């Protein structure tokens, strides 16, 4: 499923966002 493979890319993008959110909150805490 090309769409399925494509879905994987979307999932990866989503994870990156989650990581950014993590560092974001941590950065805020540090501030």
């Amino acid at each position: 499923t090309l769409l399925q493979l494509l879905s994987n890319y979307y999932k990866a993008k989503l994870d990156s966002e989650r990581i950014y959110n993590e560092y974001v909150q941590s950065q805020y805490e540090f501030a």
Partner: protein, 163 residues
């Protein structure tokens, strides 16, 4: 936290590897499919060119045949003083209009063993002619009649002689 990061780099590395693979595959198969389509289009053009020649030659021969049809008619008129206008087939029997004489008596003939039918056609006339005609023509040529085919040519002659 370093937990989730590791999971990302790993999903990015597996995802970026699955695409290039599947994508490449689709591209290969895609390319393969395209050449055949191009070949098909090329094959398709040829047929058209063949149909064009054929059509043109069919159009000239039909016209040429018609020319002979008109040419044949023009002869008969100069040589037999008789022209056949048309032909219908109303169920039982075919019919032909006719104009015979010297620059004239219109009529029709029907065919239904065989047998024939002669009917005068004066739908339109200048009375002056209609009397010019009655003086040249035997009274029976103004009424419907019926004879066997064998007698036809004989008929024909009779009318020519009187005109």
């Amino acid at each position: 936290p370093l937990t989730v990061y590791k999971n990302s780099v790993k999903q990015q590395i597996d995802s970026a590897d699955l695409l290039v693979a599947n994508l490449v595959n689709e591209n290969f198969v895609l390319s393969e499919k395209l050449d055949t389509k191009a070949t098909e289009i090329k094959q398709l053009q040829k047929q058209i060119d063949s149909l064009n020649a054929q059509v043109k030659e069919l159009k000239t021969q039909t016209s040429q045949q018609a020319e002979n049809s008109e040419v044949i008619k023009d002869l008969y008129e100069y040589l037999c003083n008789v022209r056949v206008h048309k032909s219908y087939e109303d169920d039982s029997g075919l019919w032909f209009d006719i104009s015979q004489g010297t620059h004239i008596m219109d009529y029709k003939l029907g065919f239904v063993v065989t047998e024939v039918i002669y009917a005068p056609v004066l739908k339109q006339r200048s009375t002056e002619e209609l009397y010019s005609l009655q003086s040249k023509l035997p009274e029976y040529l103004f009424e419907t009649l019926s004879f066997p085919l064998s007698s036809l040519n004989q008929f024909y002659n009779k009318i020519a002689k009187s005109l």
